[PDB]
Design a protein around this nucleic acid. Structure first.
Lengths: 81, 98, 107, 91, 92, 104, 79, 98
DNA sequence: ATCAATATCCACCTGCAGATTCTACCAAAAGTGTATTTGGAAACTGCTCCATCAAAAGGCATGTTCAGCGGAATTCCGCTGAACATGCCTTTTGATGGAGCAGTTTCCAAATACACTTTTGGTAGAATCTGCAGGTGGATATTGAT
DNA sequence: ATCAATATCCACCTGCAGATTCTACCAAAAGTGTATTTGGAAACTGCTCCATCAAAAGGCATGTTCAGCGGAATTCCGCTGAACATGCCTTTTGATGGAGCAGTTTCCAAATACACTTTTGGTAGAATCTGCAGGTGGATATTGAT
């Protein structure tokens, strides 16, 4: 059973995302604040994605489902499956 | 022994990562987090691969974005280290609290 | 039997853009020039970004356009940047940009 | 259905020796269908705001003005008009 | 020039019988209804399209409500909705 | 009427008309207009109920835009649902950043 | 000059509704600039909705529709 | 000669204006600004009484909120005086620039 | 802690602008009954691709040590905004033509709707082509110690 | 500025993977061509409600004084970045069964399509009514000073 997979987003991966974000120096508290932010972000897209899946009486979340979900949030994504 | 002063490798890595475009989060770990959050919302749910990839594309896009704004609040503060309150300010003004 | 796309002098499918305007249920009726004008705009819009993507690629010694090229082309253009200010081009990266106060030394 | 072959023509038109990857073509497809839906909807709406049951080259033009930034809109209006005018006198 | 103003007035009374409402207030309530109507209609329209369907039925209306309204608000809005349909059907 | 058939103050028949003339779809089922109307009555009720309270609270009987504003923003959910809506003549909630108050 | 028509007292008042206690001198010309860029975006879209209808009169609905597209939905003037 | 101290009257003004709902900008100077900007878009225009109201209602509403975020950006930087750069940052983080 | 100036809160008074009550007219709903059409669920099922188990290997996460430096907190100072009383220049308010915003009638260019015939973009099947990913190496910067 | 340690650069070189290449099938498009319907431009017109302007009125500009705030320079203690050793778990290459998506045909409950009869929610003219916003009195909380 899947539990605590939020820790699967390693300090290293969060450090790399910040470099792209152009961040030079990071505080120790940042990593946990970020898991939180990423957690909420995902709970929101997947809820919607899954809501779309259910309405089509399917059992598989398709990329379209994620794509429609993102559009509903003003985070339109190009190029997907 | 040779040793770069603190922050040199960091600039090195900003330059580095801003040139590439590969996802910076381990795949399998991320997929688990997706499956977890999904199944603690509904069951018997399968995922197209590309579906988990769209979600990673978006998440990283979202986080890198957040980090630039966060990095800006810090410089406004005359700091170079993004702190939690920076993310909070950014997130708020961004319209996710506020 | 000339296509409408050629009648209009376009690469883009006027007949197709006309169907989609019906299946999209946007209004009771669709004028004849509606699809013609719209495929004209869509063609114009894709030629504009491709012009830029292609350049980005030349500047990258690459012959084939890839997502980062579309990304670099879109973010470097004021107007495309605004038109897609809420679109995320997957596998595109970001624009190299490091705040000044971060660089070392002085002057 | 895709816009791929059409994107390819134009592509070859601007850059005769350049190719496009599939992901890139994929994003170019997403792009087209996106602009297509915004202009459509802006048009659709405009008509209802005017108690008009028909979308025409005139709603499309306004939609294009409301949706596209500065210099792009100007040029897009031309292209649209030019094409309508041409197709108009061809039959 | 239609407006939900009279129906708004009805509802008001069932909730605050002694309470009245100024014009400007009543106009805001009108925009408010028109707004959610469009937001709900649109999402439903959209849902039918993604599923290549021709009809916007209450199933559509329902899901859209789940997508648009905040949790608990959505909870009741669904019940309310479901109840209204049940009543309408179970009627000669 | 249909509203009466479904037990509602809102105009089911009208809502139905508006769903057709709205070009939202080729066809409109019979429940949709009923279900939707139910939700508009309910949402309407929720806001009026809170704003009525806001009026009693300020010692007034007739509700004004300011009472719609106060009911909306002082409510996590409705405030979310109207997060990008500006209510004319509503004003803002009374709020002062603590750090700006005189040093007691 | 009209933009200068938006006065310091008026601007200082707005800021107060925003819970602002102390206002730097440079904020006023900065402010008018925001407002200028604001109106321009809205008014253009409204004037456009105006012309589409072939009117020589901007109607409050043309502003409401404008605002809706800017993502600034405004309840009070219909719709 | 009793005199109030810096910020005491302002604070009382905050209180004051957060209760009222009226426009804080005078109608005429504003109508003039709206008209001049419109003129650059289409000449010989006439504005409905309500159209100008809406625009004003929206502008103050807009400006007011921009002020709350600025105040927050000032406070984030251990200040209490909202400065230009404080507005600058807010608008950048709202996408009004990026 | 002690006055002394102001501001703020409150119980009450009352004209009036705007909310309410009443009648009447009415086209445009919205309800209702007939009968013709159809979307999409149900039932069978082909077939894509999702999950998942297996294994070998190094790309990378983890955890530790060390010290450079950046953030936090304290002090100090010049300059900048807040508060005020003076003063009048502009906005505000109530009135009066006429310009267009709409309500209505006309009628033709243009959009269904239907039946065919024709051209095509999608494609799955196989197979030849090619841009660059990624590995190598060694000449040119970038850095940091002295 | 010199010098040793490292990283960055970049042009040459080879190989798999993904792209450009065809043969033919072709349902579903898109085109062509009467026949029948109609939406909305176009010209005419009355009624609002908008632009203009006069003069009653309610704020704003202006100069002064100074309190206190932001910017600057300083100090120091702790926490984050660099460098390193170690070893695990992710990535990769493959294969298998079976779920559950998506295709195809059947076919009735539900929906569009008039057509007829009833009701009703919007408007316009008129009179009645009433919730509260400004207005006053007077007590009392708040603030700034000595």
């Amino acid at each position: 059973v899947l539990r605590d997979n939020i820790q699967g987003i390693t300090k290293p991966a969060i450090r790399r995302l910040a470099r792209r974000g152009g961040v030079k120096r990071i505080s120790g508290l940042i990593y946990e604040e970020t898991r939180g932010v990423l957690k909420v972000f995902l709970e929101n897209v997947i809820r919607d994605a899954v809501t779309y899946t259910e309405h089509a009486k399917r059992k598989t979340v398709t990329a379209m489902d994620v794509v429609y979900a993102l559009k509903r949030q003003g985070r339109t994504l190009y190029g997907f499956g | 022994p040779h040793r770069y002063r603190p922050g040199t490798v960091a600039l090195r890595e900003i330059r580095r990562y801003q040139k590439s475009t590969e996802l910076l989060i381990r795949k399998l770990p991320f997929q688990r987090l997706v499956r977890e959050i999904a199944q603690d919302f509904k069951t018997d749910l399968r995922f197209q691969s590309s579906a988990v990839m769209a979600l990673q594309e978006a998440s990283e896009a979202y986080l890198v974005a957040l980090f630039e704004d966060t990095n800006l609040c810090a410089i406004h503060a005359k700091h170079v280290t993004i702190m939690p309150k920076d993310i909070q300010l950014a997130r708020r003004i961004r319209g996710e609290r506020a | 039997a000339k296509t409408r796309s050629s009648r209009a002098g376009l690469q883009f499918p006027v007949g197709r853009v006309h169907r989609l305007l019906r299946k999209g249920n946007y209004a009771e009726r669709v004028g004849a020039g509606a699809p013609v004008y719209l495929a004209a705009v869509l063609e114009y819009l894709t030629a504009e970004i491709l012009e830029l993507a292609g350049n980005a690629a030349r500047d990258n010694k690459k012959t084939r356009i890839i997502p980062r090229h579309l990304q670099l082309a879109v973010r470097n253009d004021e107007e495309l940047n605004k038109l897609l200010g809420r679109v995320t081009i997957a596998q595109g990266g970001v624009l190299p940009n490091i705040q000044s106060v971060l660089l070392p030394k002085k002057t | 259905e895709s816009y791929a072959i059409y994107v390819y023509k134009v592509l070859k038109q601007v850059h005769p020796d350049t190719g496009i990857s599939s992901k890139a073509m994929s994003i170019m497809n997403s792009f087209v269908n996106d602009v297509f839906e915004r202009i459509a909807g802006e048009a659709s709406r405009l008509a209802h705001y005017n108690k008009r049951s028909t979308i025409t080259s005139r709603e499309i033009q306004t939609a294009v003005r409301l949706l596209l930034p500065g210099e792009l809109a100007k040029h897009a209006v031309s292209e649209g008009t030019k094409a309508v005018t041409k197709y108009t006198s061809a039959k």
